[PDB]
């Protein structure tokens, strides 16, 4: 019953959970903090993100292992194997979807509308794009088509803001562009848009490097390198 807990206590407990590598707990504490209805700080957006991405990250990894076993099993086509792995893949899939829906719920009910600056709005829209992308990876239907569209719309709105409101070296802007490029390549089957967006992103960033603090420089160049890693992969 986190509704009655002190916000500061929830934040403290999220940090304790992080130190103990208890990421489900950490996420639950940050959900409770979000639900107090106040804006988040920078540190708090980091705690929220780290917590939920550890949770969904584990689920995604497990789903990927199971999907591969499932597919290998089915290809072999042995008339006695397959039902168990399907059922268990579905179980993990259901749990992943539930976590994604929770995150999307928080973004919609509390975080996106209540953001008071461009930077945090873009972070939350990016997040929305990411959690729809994680849903898209396991979706199949017409459902898959609607989710892909929802992801694209979230990312596009973030990109539109970040271009007007933020420098090209800003880590939030960079991470958004990195992720939207991965969306293009891995999800929306648009390798050309992927490459184009990554190239533009990396170059515009590079041009402004000379302006940054020593610390800011390390943050920006980290993401630029992954942009590079992906361009090397996609060509």
């Amino acid at each position: 019953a986190m509704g009655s807990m002190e916000r500061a206590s929830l934040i403290q407990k999220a940090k304790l959970a992080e130190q103990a590598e208890r990421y489900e707990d950490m996420a639950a504490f940050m959900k409770g903090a979000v639900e107090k209805g106040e804006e988040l700080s920078c540190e708090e957006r980091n705690l929220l993100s780290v917590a939920y991405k550890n949770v969904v990250g584990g689920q995604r990894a497990a789903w990927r292992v199971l999907s591969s076993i499932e597919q290998k099993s089915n290809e072999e086509g042995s008339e006695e194997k397959g039902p168990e792995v399907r059922e268990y893949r579905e179980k993990v899939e259901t749990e992943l979807q539930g976590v994604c829906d929770t995150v999307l719920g928080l973004l919609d009910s509390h975080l996106i509308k209540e953001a008071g600056d461009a930077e945090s709005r873009v972070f939350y829209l990016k997040m929305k794009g990411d959690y729809y992308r994680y849903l898209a990876e396991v979706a199949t239907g017409d459902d898959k088509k609607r989710i892909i569209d929802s992801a694209r719309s979230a990312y596009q709105e973030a990109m539109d803001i970040s271009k007007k409101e933020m420098p090209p070296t800003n880590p939030i802007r960079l991470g958004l562009a990195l992720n939207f490029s991965v969306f293009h390549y891995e999800i929306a089957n648009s390798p050309e848009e992927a490459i184009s967006l990554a190239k533009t992103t990396f170059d515009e960033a590079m041009a402004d490097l000379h302006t940054l603090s020593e610390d800011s420089y390390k943050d920006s160049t980290l993401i630029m390198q992954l942009l590079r890693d992906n361009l090397t992969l996609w060509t």
Binding site: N46, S49, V50, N54, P171, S181, L222, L226, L233
Partner: peptide, 11 residues
């Protein structure tokens, strides 16, 4: 090899 997205680290 899957494309690399933004890492899960504090920024």
């Amino acid at each position: 090899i899957r494309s690399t997205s933004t890492p899960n680290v504090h920024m």
